[model samples]
Target: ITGTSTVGVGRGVLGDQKNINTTYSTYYYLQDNTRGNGIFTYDAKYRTTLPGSLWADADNQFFASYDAPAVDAHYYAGVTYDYYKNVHNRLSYDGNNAAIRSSVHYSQGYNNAFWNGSQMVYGDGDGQTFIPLSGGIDVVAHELTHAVTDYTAGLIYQNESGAINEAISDIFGTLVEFYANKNPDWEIGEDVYTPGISGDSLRSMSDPAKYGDPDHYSKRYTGTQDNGGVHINSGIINKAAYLISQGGTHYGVSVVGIGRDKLGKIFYRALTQYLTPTSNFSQLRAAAVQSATDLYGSTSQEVASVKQAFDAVGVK
Candidate 1:
């Protein structure tokens, strides 16, 4: 919808106050013209239909309780767009400034969110498990990165390849969280995962075993559930990514930390340049090492850390 761009103030699902991007014609709409072609957010109205309707406000203000999810969805999409454009020198999820679209409040008591291969969708959660998932920037970034992966590596969505896809999302998701500098941590969905729980998240990159996920390759799940445990086994790669960025000793192995900027540069390069549709964990290691070498040098500590990080997680 074309309209005059405006700004609105509102609280997010977590009660954090932030300014939101809106458009005004007759009523304020949750359309941000500041990033890409535009970032548009819609309200699902607790139904299953997707991209329900462009959110509208009365007077360019979105303080109502029902407006919280749209506010976060619009605002965080801008932040994620900025992260890719400013930090990565990439245009948008497609490297072509695609109009980012999102829908919130999808399905009553819905407990999950996904990219759906076209646009982002957020569930309002079952109250006991999650709130509005867009409240977590990491969650939003994670889903958006799926679109990024779809355009770039196009990793197959099952088995080891699917796990790699999931890990890349988690990896970049955490990087976006750190880029935003919003009390960043190596945890996924900590903000809106469980309102009643503290210091808990949907997944932990620092120690995936904390959430019953595999921290080492030896513990990877071989079951057919969850697309061959894409979410569960991604923890192994997540641990490697964390080790590459933060450096640590795990399972009697040590990795030299190369910091987040280099980690992101290497992974972004690998995702865009080296990876293939069926790349598995071992192939991901090679890709990261090659990416680090491309950014730094073959013998640079960045490349060494990339190798060590993978080895520490037994990716070999």
Candidate 2:
């Protein structure tokens, strides 16, 4: 729990229900779920939808001879584990051997899936709109990545910080999805949704503008729904990250051999090492560029590309 914390508290302090002011009433109930249970409330019935033949069903989401829930969740958990260790050398979510718990089949016929403060939780999906959130490696990994955000910038769930949080999740989520198979197309979560669904997966980091939403990082995108559109507005940063790391033409700008990979490592380093709860997009952008210069060189193309991408996203 070195870097982990609930929504609001002094630095390095676990969110305390007893200390929270009941009279303030500024969405405090939603922050730590103090209105119901403290941040660490654990439900037993919820379980993932992975195959049991592959895993031990540590949380009991299946019957003997095959527990479907344990199989993929463990596999995905290990994937995330290895992703962080290999990509960032992060010990775990908290830079310690902090245990990770994944729960699926959340609310019956739930419309959406989300991550709580302490653990990852998912819904079975309404079967029409969404299938099972667990079945998608990218989606699952994306939810787990939010925990990393909680520990790092703990970006406010509004405006730029929120966008960065979602962007970070998408960045690693796509990496995990691609790393899981390294497919040529690098599509995300093709298996999770019903075959009839129109959309492919969540936001496309490679091409956010293609989603056809007027609110996707365009000038018309107003911060309102989805926690100030954190889930949606993140396309800007997501697209920026993809272009910056991979090196390509975007928004009329073109570059080659742009050290997006190096920039990504620096961003991860800044998030996990230097950022604080109040850090914003500007600070994030600055930290990542600084991290790049510190790691490679002042003239490193990685630093230039990252800085350019930030400017491309409409930042300074």
TM-score of each: 0.99, 0.74
lDDT of 2 by residue, 1-316 (tens): 1122223221100111112111123222112222212222123244444211111212222222122323344345656767777777776676665666655446577645567787777666666766656556677678878888887678777776787787788777877776666342234455566557755754566666566422223442565877776766777777667767676766666644354356457778877766766666678778878887888788987778877777666655
The digit string of per-residue lDDT tens for model 1 on 1-316 reads 8788888888888778889878899998888888879999999999989889888888877777888888898888999999999999999899999999999999999989999989999999988899888899999999999999999999999999999999999999999999999889999999998789888999999999999999999999999999999999999999999999899999888898989998899999999999999999999999999889888989899988898888898888
Best by lDDT: 1
Colliding pairs, model 1? none
Residue 89, model 2: Cα distance from true site in angstroms: 1.3
The reply for model 2, stretches above 4 Å from the true place, is 1-66, 182-188, 213-220, 257-260
